[PDB]
Enzyme design. Structure first.
Site, PDB file in Angstrom:
ATOM      1  N   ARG A   1       0.836  -1.190   0.000  1.00  9.44           N
ATOM      2  CA  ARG A   1       0.000   0.000   0.000  1.00  9.44           C
ATOM      3  C   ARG A   1       0.874   1.245   0.000  1.00  9.44           C
ATOM      4  NH1 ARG A   1      -5.410  -0.892   3.794  1.00  9.44           N
ATOM      5  NH2 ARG A   1      -6.040  -2.889   2.857  1.00  9.44           N
TER       6      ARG A   1
ATOM      7  N   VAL B   1      -0.529  -2.545  -4.618  1.00 10.59           N
ATOM      8  CA  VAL B   1       0.139  -3.551  -5.434  1.00 10.59           C
ATOM      9  C   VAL B   1      -0.503  -4.900  -5.140  1.00 10.59           C
ATOM     10  CG1 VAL B   1       2.307  -4.681  -5.998  1.00 10.59           C
ATOM     11  CG2 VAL B   1       2.278  -2.241  -5.453  1.00 10.59           C
TER      12      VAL B   1
ATOM     13  N   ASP C   1      15.742   7.668  -3.898  1.00 11.71           N
ATOM     14  CA  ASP C   1      14.836   7.321  -2.809  1.00 11.71           C
ATOM     15  C   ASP C   1      15.176   5.957  -2.221  1.00 11.71           C
ATOM     16  OD1 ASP C   1      12.822   7.189  -0.974  1.00 11.71           O
ATOM     17  OD2 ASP C   1      11.195   7.591  -2.387  1.00 11.71           O
TER      18      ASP C   1
HETATM   19  C1  LIG Z   1       1.898   6.416 -10.318  1.00 10.58           C
HETATM   20  O1  LIG Z   1       2.781   7.042  -9.434  1.00 10.58           O
HETATM   21  C2  LIG Z   1       3.685   6.169  -8.816  1.00 10.58           C
HETATM   22  C3  LIG Z   1       4.055   6.770  -7.458  1.00 10.58           C
HETATM   23  N1  LIG Z   1       4.596   7.966  -7.268  1.00 10.58           N
HETATM   24  O2  LIG Z   1       4.769   8.132  -5.956  1.00 10.58           O
HETATM   25  C4  LIG Z   1       4.342   7.049  -5.325  1.00 10.58           C
HETATM   26  C5  LIG Z   1       4.361   6.831  -3.806  1.00 10.58           C
HETATM   27  N2  LIG Z   1       4.263   5.416  -3.475  1.00 10.58           N
HETATM   28  C6  LIG Z   1       2.999   4.714  -3.672  1.00 10.58           C
HETATM   29  O3  LIG Z   1       2.060   5.294  -4.102  1.00 10.58           O
HETATM   30  C7  LIG Z   1       2.887   3.227  -3.317  1.00 10.58           C
HETATM   31  C8  LIG Z   1       3.827   2.655  -2.475  1.00 10.58           C
HETATM   32  C9  LIG Z   1       3.735   1.313  -2.141  1.00 10.58           C
HETATM   33  C10 LIG Z   1       4.797   0.704  -1.201  1.00 10.58           C
HETATM   34  N3  LIG Z   1       5.218   1.819  -0.289  1.00 10.58           N
HETATM   35  C11 LIG Z   1       6.678   2.131  -0.199  1.00 10.58           C
HETATM   36  O4  LIG Z   1       7.042   3.007   0.507  1.00 10.58           O
HETATM   37  N4  LIG Z   1       7.683   1.363  -0.974  1.00 10.58           N
HETATM   38  C12 LIG Z   1       7.268   0.298  -1.832  1.00 10.58           C
HETATM   39  C13 LIG Z   1       8.283  -0.799  -2.165  1.00 10.58           C
HETATM   40  C14 LIG Z   1       5.832   0.070  -2.074  1.00 10.58           C
HETATM   41  C15 LIG Z   1       5.532  -1.248  -2.780  1.00 10.58           C
HETATM   42  O5  LIG Z   1       4.804  -2.046  -2.293  1.00 10.58           O
HETATM   43  N5  LIG Z   1       6.213  -1.456  -4.046  1.00 10.58           N
HETATM   44  C16 LIG Z   1       6.116  -2.669  -4.829  1.00 10.58           C
HETATM   45  C17 LIG Z   1       6.424  -2.652  -6.192  1.00 10.58           C
HETATM   46  C18 LIG Z   1       6.375  -3.830  -6.926  1.00 10.58           C
HETATM   47  C19 LIG Z   1       6.039  -5.049  -6.287  1.00 10.58           C
HETATM   48  N6  LIG Z   1       5.921  -6.309  -6.745  1.00 10.58           N
HETATM   49  N7  LIG Z   1       5.577  -7.143  -5.748  1.00 10.58           N
HETATM   50  C20 LIG Z   1       5.470  -6.438  -4.636  1.00 10.58           C
HETATM   51  C21 LIG Z   1       5.762  -5.068  -4.943  1.00 10.58           C
HETATM   52  C22 LIG Z   1       5.815  -3.871  -4.200  1.00 10.58           C
HETATM   53  C23 LIG Z   1       2.706   0.539  -2.647  1.00 10.58           C
HETATM   54  C24 LIG Z   1       1.762   1.112  -3.488  1.00 10.58           C
HETATM   55  C25 LIG Z   1       1.855   2.457  -3.820  1.00 10.58           C
HETATM   56  F1  LIG Z   1       0.927   3.017  -4.647  1.00 10.58           F
HETATM   57  N8  LIG Z   1       3.889   6.192  -6.246  1.00 10.58           N
END
Ligand SMILES: COCc1noc(CNC(=O)c2cc([C@@H]3NC(=O)N[C@@H](C)[C@H]3C(=O)Nc3ccc4n[nH]cc4c3)ccc2F)n1
Lengths: 57, 617, 336
Positions: free
Chosen positions: B170, B176, B288
């Protein structure tokens, strides 16, 4: 533009000018005479009966 | 559900489609995963001339993947005797004097690096670039390549193409999910991001940037970054299809396991560096880097994810103060001060410290004050429990000035690998994920948008060719070819029952299947096989001959029209009539539109100069 | 300059040829034929309608048997029709889609065709049907071709020339230069020793096949000459033109005899042919109709209205029984 082709033009006209022509009255008679001798053999001029027409059946 | 390959008749339209873009060369087809497998399947099996050339090439590739010299010493001789010596004895060695001597020289001297047979690789391609590649195009293996390349250029992914599962992350802009692609069954992760929650935070720019950043790094298959295979959107959300990492992030595991010893932290540092080396080689600063952005797989190996704040510095260097407080370099915090990859190297030192001490190197007295943590960034005394090798490492990674920062001194990431803290590691074994991971993970409203807000995402959809081909190669590629081979061989063996082809022996320009429109109220679409000639367009059903057609003279214009949200072609006729066509895929539609336009324009300019054919008063 | 006196002497010879022709205009063909009875009204009907072409029809030619006919169509095919039953004896897909003309050999064993491909292709009919020769040499489109026999053939092209070909060797034996515009049609004299051609220069030319020279040049039309046909006796020929008039030219008289026109007809003529006796002159028009003219009196005898697009070709059988009409509407109709 070319001299060689201007000579060829004059020579061709010479061949076209030095021929034996006939009176148009004579040429027009031979044609009119031909149409009379073969008017009977002309299925478009003389309607042939269906028994001799390959397309009426 | 499953991938359905187009009929072999697709070869006529695809070949002209690819040839128009210079995509029908040896370089471009050989370097594609599916192209290589088919070109190899052609040489090894269906051409005795090219069989040894590929086996030699393939043996060299296997030789490059040998881990130890004792394995190369034993293989460099086999490759030499079988593909070099045996050929020289038969005078059939089709290579230069330089390539042969370069290999024999290193053999008698027992110096066998993994790049030993590179001079041969260059010449093996030279031997294949010509006549063998031309006969390959003429073969029916290149037809199947066109069948596969057609399904790739016709990819239109929707939520239905994925079986979405549990949530695994989240953030501020979306969630995700873990999902499975129904096409090939490949397990992926789907980062679904809300367009509404995007505009509410005015983060539209960052959204487009992450996908652009994911594109720059998703090539080469890096095992230490969460890369992208697809990108699509709905009217409401944006979807990223990324590598699946269902082991959680380090921020969570750090809070669960506690601080990591110097040896456990050396594992994550090694794999994180290799990921940074992947971005830095592609001119991308992550900016970051912190434990929350490091994801674990099922075994414990880690990848860097979320390239939202990453940016390209190939053209202009970023100066903005972006990142997470506590991990940002002095150059970064200072606004109006451009910086390079050094931010990640500094961020690495800031992060690696926290893995050892539980808190960022600058977050003092557990403060929640942002203006005090950045203050310390512009000595940082390290505890006495840190070994001299670890102490010297962070000392170089956290230097206030970039002129003395470890990793910003010229050689790049190599300066961090040579650090005495990593003296025990074989970085090839790190790249190969051979080291044991220390931790094994156990098992708002009142906002609208449209029209002017959905143009920002028009270039969002995307497909990484390398990713999709690698996915298909390792899943259904072999299984589909077998089922399509047996299915195609039946129609021909069965067509001998029915019975010559209508396109051979003439001046046909192109042919294929198209669906012409009948009565629209009846959804009447007649699927006919068309034949485009320089002066007419014929079509027919099955078993019969073309009984109708349309002449290039009748055709006035060729436009593209949307009919039920499907790309269709609108042909306006001179007699006030109209003619609508529908294709099985986008490449077919793109080609038919170009050729039809070129055909009616060339045919009409030609008819005007023929007194017997042109129209008169 | 010598180039001057060669342009001036060409004018003085053109005048000499005009004076020599006026000196033969003692009377007209209309005055001579004022006494013979008119032919009445010729009323022909459609006997056969030939369906099988998918696009415009461009040319047709009768076989000597007055039964088989070949046609060239915009659909890139040649269809050899059995006009008695309308069955398709042969259907030939051509290597080029830009076909313009077609011909039937006197023996009936070969057919020829061509067009923008700049080739006259000979098709052997004797068991399959494939090309037996590709006659290349012209630098322009093949507008017309007619066999002398199974071994020779005459062609007309958009390169402003005609040619005689040896079929076995595929050689361009003799060429016929003289026209200054695209040659659009040729007609062989009955004795096969001469042929006439019409071009876009608005002139027709009489050629000797053996001597390879041009003997006479007939001017008078105001626009392109699209069609040409010999009078059955070989002493005259007819021409169709875009100026909406047909014209009869006599050889021994060396000039025009009759103009077949009408203020009610504005479009151009695409084809011409004579009835077996030469009495009737048929012409295909661009207004979708074929007009039957009285060759001797110049009156309009009949009309063949049965096509919904341009009439692009026609031909009278050797027995004069029927006449064929090819149109841009894809159909050939047999009138009789
Ligand atoms: C379209 O714009 C993109 C964007 N710009 O700023 C942002 C700010 N971040 C989010 O919004 C967002 C963040 C997360 C999780 N929160 C975090 O601090 N770090 C991550 C590793 C993240 C995640 O689950 N990352 C991932 C990424 C790929 C993955 N594959 N399997 C598990 C995974 C986890 C989760 C959901 C989010 F939406 N997003």
């Amino acid at each position: 533009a070319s001299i060689a082709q201007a000579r060829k033009l004059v020579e061709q006209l010479k061949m076209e000018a030095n021929i034996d022509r006939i009176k148009v009255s004579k040429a027009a008679a031979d044609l009119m005479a031909y149409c009379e001798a073969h008017a009977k053999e002309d299925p478009l001029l003389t309607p042939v009966p269906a028994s001799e027409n390959p397309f009426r059946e | 559900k499953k991938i359905l390959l187009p009929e072999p008749s697709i070869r006529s339209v695809m070949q002209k489609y690819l040839e128009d873009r210079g995509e029908v060369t040896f370089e471009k087809i050989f370097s594609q995963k599916l192209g290589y497998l088919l070109f190899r399947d052609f040489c090894l099996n269906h051409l005795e001339e090219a069989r040894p050339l590929v086996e030699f090439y393939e043996e060299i590739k296997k030789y490059e993947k040998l881990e130890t010299e004792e394995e190369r010493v034993a293989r460099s001789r086999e490759i030499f005797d079988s593909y070099i010596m045996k050929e020289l004895l038969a005078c059939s060695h089709p290579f230069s004097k330089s390539a042969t001597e370069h290999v024999q020289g290193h053999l008698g001297k027992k110096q066998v690096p993994p790049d030993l047979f590179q001079p041969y690789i260059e010449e093996i391609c030279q031997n294949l670039r010509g006549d063998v590649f031309q006969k390959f195009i003429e073969s029916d293996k290149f037809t199947r390549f066109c069948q596969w390349k057609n399904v790739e250029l016709n990819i239109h992914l929707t939520m239905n193409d994925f079986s979405v599962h549990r949530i695994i992350g989240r953030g501020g802009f979306g969630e995700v999910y873990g999902c499975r692609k129904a096409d090939t069954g490949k397990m992926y992760a789907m980062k679904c991001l809300d367009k509404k929650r995007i505009k509410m935070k005015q983060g539209e720019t960052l959204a487009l940037n992450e996908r652009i950043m994911l594109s720059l790094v998703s090539t080469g298959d890096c095992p230490f970054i969460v890369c992208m295979s697809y990108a699509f959107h709905t009217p409401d959300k944006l979807s990223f299809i990324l590598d699946l990492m269902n082991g959680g992030d380090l921020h969570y595991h750090l809070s669960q396991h506690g601080v990591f010893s110097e040896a456990d932290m050396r594992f994550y540092a090694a794999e994180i560096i290799l990921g940074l080396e992947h971005m830095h080689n592609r001119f991308v600063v992550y900016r970051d880097l912190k434990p929350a952005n490091i994801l674990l797989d099922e075994h414990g190996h880690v990848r860097i994810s979320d390239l939202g704040l990453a940016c390209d510095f190939s053209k202009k260097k970023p100066h903005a103060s972006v990142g997470t407080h506590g991990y940002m370099a002095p150059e970064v915090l200072q606004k109006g001060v451009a910086y390079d990859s050094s931010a990640d190297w500094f961020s690495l030192g800031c992060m690696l410290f926290k893995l050892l001490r539980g808190h960022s190197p600058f977050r003092q007295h557990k403060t929640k004050d942002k203006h005090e943590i950045d203050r310390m960034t512009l000595a940082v005394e390290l505890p006495d429990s840190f070994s001299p090798e670890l102490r010297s490492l962070l000392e170089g990674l956290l230097q206030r000035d970039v002129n003395r920062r470890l990793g910003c001194l010229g050689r790049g990431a190599q300066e961090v690998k040579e650090s005495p803290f990593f003296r025990s590691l074989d970085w090839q074994m790190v790249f190969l994920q051979k080291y044991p991971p220390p931790l094994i993970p156990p098992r708002t409203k009142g906002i609208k948008l449209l029209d002017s807000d959905q143009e920002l995402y028009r270039n969002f959809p995307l497909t990484i060719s390398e990713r999709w081909q690698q996915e298909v190669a390792e899943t259904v590629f072999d299984t589909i070819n077998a089922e399509t081979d047996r299915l195609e061989a039946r129609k021909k063996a069965k067509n001998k029952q029915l019975g010559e082809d209508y396109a051979l022996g003439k001046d046909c320009i192109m042919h294929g299947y198209m669906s012409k429109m009948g009565n629209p109220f009846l959804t009447q679409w007649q699927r006919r096989y068309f034949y485009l000639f320089p002066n007419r367009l014929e079509w027919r059903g099955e078993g019969e001959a073309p009984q109708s057609l349309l002449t290039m003279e009748e055709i006035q214009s060729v436009e593209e029209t949307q009919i039920k949200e499907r790309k269709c072609l609108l042909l306006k006729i001179r007699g006030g009539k109209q003619f609508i066509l529908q294709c099985d895929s986008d490449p077919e539609l793109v080609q038919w539109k170009k050729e039809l336009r070129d055909a009616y324009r060339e045919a009409q300019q030609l008819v005007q100069r023929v007194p017997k054919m042109k129209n008169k008063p | 300059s010598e180039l001057d006196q060669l342009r001036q002497e060409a004018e003085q010879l053109k005048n000499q040829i005009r004076d020599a022709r006026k000196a033969c205009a003692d009377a007209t063909l209309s005055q001579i034929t004022n006494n013979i009875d008119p032919v009445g009204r010729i009323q022909m009907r459609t006997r056969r309608t030939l369906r099988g072409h998918l696009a415009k029809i461009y040319a047709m030619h009768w076989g000597t048997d007055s039964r088989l006919l070949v046609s060239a169509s915009q659909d890139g095919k040649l269809i050899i029709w059995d006009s008695y039953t309308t069955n398709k004896v042969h259907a030939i897909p051509l290597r080029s889609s830009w076909v313009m003309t077609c011909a039937y050999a006197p023996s009936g064993n070969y057919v020829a065709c061509g067009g923008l491909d700049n080739i006259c292709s000979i098709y052997n009919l004797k068991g399959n049907v494939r090309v037996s020769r590709e006659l290349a040499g012209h630098t322009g489109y093949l507008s017309c071709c007619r066999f002398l026999d199974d071994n020779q053939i005459v062609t007309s092209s958009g390169d402003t020339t005609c040619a005689l070909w040896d079929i076995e060797t595929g050689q361009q034996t003799t060429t016929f230069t003289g026209h200054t515009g695209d040659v659009m049609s040729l007609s062989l004299a009955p004795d096969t020793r001469l042929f006439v051609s019409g071009a876009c220069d608005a002139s027709a030319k009489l050629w000797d096949v053996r001597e390879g020279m041009c003997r006479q040049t007939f001017t008078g039309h105001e626009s392109d000459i699209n069609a040409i046909c010999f009078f059955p006796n070989g002493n005259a020929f007819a021409t169709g033109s875009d100026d909406a008039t047909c014209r009869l030219f006599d050889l021994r008289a060396d000039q025009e005899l009759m103009t077949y026109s009408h203020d009610n007809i504005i479009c151009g003529i695409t084809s011409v042919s004579f009835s077996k006796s030469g009495r009737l002159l048929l012409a295909g028009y661009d207004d979708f109709n074929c007009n039957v003219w009285d060759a001797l009196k110049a009156d309009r005898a009949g009309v063949l209205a049965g096509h919904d697009n341009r009439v692009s070709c026609l031909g009278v059988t050797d027995d004069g029984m029927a006449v064929a009409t090819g149109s841009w509407d894809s159909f050939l109709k047999i009138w009789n």
